[PDB]
């Protein structure tokens, strides 16, 4: 072979830090570790992939399987070369042949692919790619559309039963059987991760840590291999295995020899983990699971988990939950926010140290307005979390709810406490007109809990008009947590039903309180935790707050609030 290196298996603790130095100056210590691991491995003979009757069976002449671990198909008599398919056995942290790393089937290979799944008794396919990327084919669609209901490739009959469609992955529940062979059908689980770019990396490591938690959860009735394929089967797939394995390896020895495990992989299939970015990714995955761990109760076991999470037997100490809140970062000066700190703009902030990050501040097609873009459960949908308008910005405010096409506004504050103004009053009884836009409220409905106001907006661009709803919530001073939650909830429902839900930076919702973080964070949270409690019966309060804390400063910056989420999410699900 060659002269690689000898890296020191990282121990749990120092992981966080090792990572830090390994990445200083655009991580050359990493670019080195990954640079030394050879593309292919000279020795290991690759004679069967190259054969002539198998040329068309490969997706890239660049990626061909070693001969000793190549997955084999029941040699069809006569038809020479029917034992070959582009796939390869891969070893985990122990289980030899735990996975099958395979090239995305070709339209001409689709039948040999479902043959491998039947002959290998695999009942867990993990697709980490998209059939179409950049207008080029990266993988044929080897499955029936929920419509066709059932399609049979060759002698293998595939029928889909369920089709769940989450934010990053789509989980399908199939039933396959060989009808030319009296034997009974098998339940297959197919996951497709769509938030992963070819040769690239996802957005947040937690996304990867995410589907891992969920493939480990799927049932493998035949102790068969786990099919992990992508386009060539080496890049994104190699990376996934990396994490899965190295995690076991951590949850096992509190150490991790990534370098080693990659080299070990690169010995079974060429170019596995094809990018420095994916290399650095695997580490981050470990550094973050290590750091914050697994925070994601299931609606099934919510009340149990939370109940003990809240108790601290030796009271001279905090509760486990408190532990959690403390592990939660607080990006204090996390990123650039100069825009918000200009001379004229410092008088455009109800609060000087609650300025939007330059990285997400709402442009004012550009001018300034203290409002932050917030990520929504369903990507790429986004909502604005701004501050109650200032007696002088009331004009800009409407420009924003008009330009970004807001449909519903949620005001969590009163117009003013005692004598001091907590917010201005962007609305009047008349036909208030701010700059190019003209508002005109048409209705004002007061309820024991909130108050709905229906405005009709326009410009000199008349004979059109957009109707804008505003829900103002009362029972909730910037202090006491929402008085009686059960109704805070009802609000969130009625509000939700007025916004569409069809899925152009045109954010439909807009939420605000004094600084747009104080109590606006609690809201945004609840929103996503609810939309997830519905679509997956699962809930990760920690991570949700971690992305908020990351979006604008000031949100859920107190244990009282953090814990609040837990409470409400729970009482509204027995």
């Amino acid at each position: 072979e060659k002269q690689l290196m000898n890296v020191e298996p990282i121990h749990a603790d120092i992981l966080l830090e090792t990572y830090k130095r390994k990445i200083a100056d655009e991580g050359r210590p990493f670019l080195a570790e990954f640079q030394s691991i050879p593309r292919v491995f000279s020795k290991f003979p690759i004679k069967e992939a190259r054969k002539p009757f198998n040329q068309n069976k490969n997706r890239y002449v660049d990626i061909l399987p070693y001969d000793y671990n190549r997955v084999e198909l029941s040699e069809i008599n006569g038809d020479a070369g029917s034992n070959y398919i582009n796939a390869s056995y891969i070893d985990g942290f122990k289980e030899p042949r735990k996975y099958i790393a395979a090239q995305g089937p070709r339209d001409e290979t689709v039948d040999d692919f479902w043959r491998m799944i039947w002959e290998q008794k695999a009942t867990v396919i993990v697709m980490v790619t998209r059939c179409e990327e950049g207008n080029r084919n990266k993988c044929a669609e080897y499955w029936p559309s929920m419509e066709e209901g059932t399609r049979a490739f060759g002698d293998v009959v595939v029928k889909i039963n369920q089709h769940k469609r989450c934010p990053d992955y789509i989980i399908q529940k199939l039933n396959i059987v060989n009808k030319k062979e009296k034997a009974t059908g098998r339940e297959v689980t197919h996951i497709q991760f769509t938030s992963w770019p070819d040769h690239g990396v996802p957005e947040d490591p937690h996304l990867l840590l995410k589907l891992r938690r969920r493939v480990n959860a799927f049932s493998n009735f035949f102790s068969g291999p786990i099919v992990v394929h992508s386009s060539a089967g080496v890049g994104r797939t190699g990376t996934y295995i990396g994490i899965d394995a190295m995690l076991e390896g951590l949850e096992a020895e509190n150490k991790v020899d990534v370098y080693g495990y990659v080299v070990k992989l690169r010995r079974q299939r060429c170019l596995m983990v094809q990018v420095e970015a994916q290399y650095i990714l695997i580490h981050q995955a470990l550094v973050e699971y290590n750091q914050f761990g697994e925070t994601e109760v299931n609606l099934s076991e919510l009340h149990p988990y939370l109940h003990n999470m809240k108790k601290r037997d030796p009271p001279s100490e905090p509760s486990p939950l408190e532990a959690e809140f403390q592990r939660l970062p607080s990006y204090r000066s996390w990123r650039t926010q100069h825009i918000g700190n200009q001379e004229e703009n410092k008088s455009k902030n109800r609060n000087s140290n609650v300025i939007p990050y330059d990285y997400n501040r709402v442009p004012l097609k550009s001018k300034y307005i203290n409002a932050s873009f917030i990520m929504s459960y369903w990507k790429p949908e986004v909502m604005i979390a701004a501050q109650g308008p200032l007696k002088e910005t009331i004009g800009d405010f409407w420009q924003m709810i008009f330009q970004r096409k807001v449909k519903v506004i949620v005001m969590l504050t009163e117009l003013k406490h005692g004598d001091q103004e907590i917010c201005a009053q962007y609305w009047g009884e008349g036909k208030q007109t701010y700059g190019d836009i003209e508002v005109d409220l048409k209705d004002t409905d007061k309820s024991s809990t909130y108050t709905l106001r229906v405005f009709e907006l326009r410009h000199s661009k008349r004979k059109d008009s957009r109707t804008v709803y505003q829900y103002q919530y009362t029972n909730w001073s910037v202090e006491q947590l929402p008085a009686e939650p059960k109704e805070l909830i009802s609000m969130i429902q009625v509000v939700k039903q007025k916004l569409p839900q069809k899925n152009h930076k045109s954010t439909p919702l807009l939420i605000h309180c004094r600084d747009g973080s104080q109590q606006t964070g609690i809201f945004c949270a609840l929103l996503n935790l609810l939309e997830s409690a519905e679509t997956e019966e699962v809930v990760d309060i920690f991570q949700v707050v971690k992305a908020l804390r990351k979006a604008r400063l000031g949100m859920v910056s107190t244990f009282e609030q953090y814990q609040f989420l837990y409470d409400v999410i729970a009482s509204t699900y027995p």
Partner: peptide
């Protein structure tokens, strides 16, 4: 043809 890694 078509080289994966490019």
């Amino acid at each position: 043809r078509e080289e994966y890694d490019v």
